[PDB]
């Protein structure tokens, strides 16, 4: 095979799925008895075997490739709001860059794993890290997956074309970023800012 994006999409796919899954544990989108802690990217990260979720991310990952990789994927935002009665409280936003000028394609294997390990290391850690930094939390919140494209993005009932909603009042804190000639992944999470009045 003479693929190109598939390579980056491979890491980017497992990267998002790993970083995302970890988010749910770090956040509390479902019972902890459903996830498994593993050592991927050379470091320890947790994962989940949730079928429903796996089915949610399956469609996302499947189309992420078809709909996103076939239209350029640049950034990703995640809106997490307490379903019980807390509105938007946590919003996990990560940047995704697929293919960064490489018309050559004359280099055996074009994918950075080491630099990846570092990012993914901080990505899995930053999620879990901030949580510990938070004063306890675990609400049956709802999920909102956001995707950032470039050209005209055509969506039916699957997604909602927008994004600027930028929550109502939350602070965004940078955690880490990485840019390679084959792809670039950024990491920054935001949560509801206290002191409303």
């Amino acid at each position: 095979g003479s693929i190109t994006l598939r390579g980056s999409a491979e890491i980017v796919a497992e990267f998002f799925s790993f970083g995302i899954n970890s988010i749910l544990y770090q956040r509390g989108i479902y019972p902890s008895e459903t996830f498994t802690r593993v050592q991927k990217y050379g470091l320890t990260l947790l994962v989940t075997t949730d079928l429903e979720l796996i089915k949610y991310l399956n469609n996302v990952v499947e189309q992420l490739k078809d709909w996103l990789y076939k239209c350029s994927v640049q950034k990703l935002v995640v809106v997490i709001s307490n379903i019980e009665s807390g509105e938007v409280l946590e919003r996990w936003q990560f940047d995704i860059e697929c293919d960064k000028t490489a018309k050559d394609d004359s280099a055996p294997r074009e994918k950075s794993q080491k630099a990846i390990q570092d990012e993914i290391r901080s990505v899995i850690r930053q999620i879990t890290a901030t949580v510990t930094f938070l004063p306890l939390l675990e609400v049956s919140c709802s999920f909102d997956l956001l995707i950032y494209t470039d050209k005209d993005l055509v969506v039916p009932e699957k997604w909602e074309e927008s994004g600027p909603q930028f929550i109502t009042n939350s602070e965004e804190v940078r955690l880490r970023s990485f840019t390679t000639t084959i792809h670039k992944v950024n990491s920054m999470v935001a949560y509801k800012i206290p002191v409303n009045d």
């Binding site: 950034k75 997956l145 956001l146």
Partner: peptide, 10 residues
Amino acid sequence: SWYSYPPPQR
């Protein structure tokens, strides 16, 4: 142009 993905239901 970014997307918005809705959550589950029940």
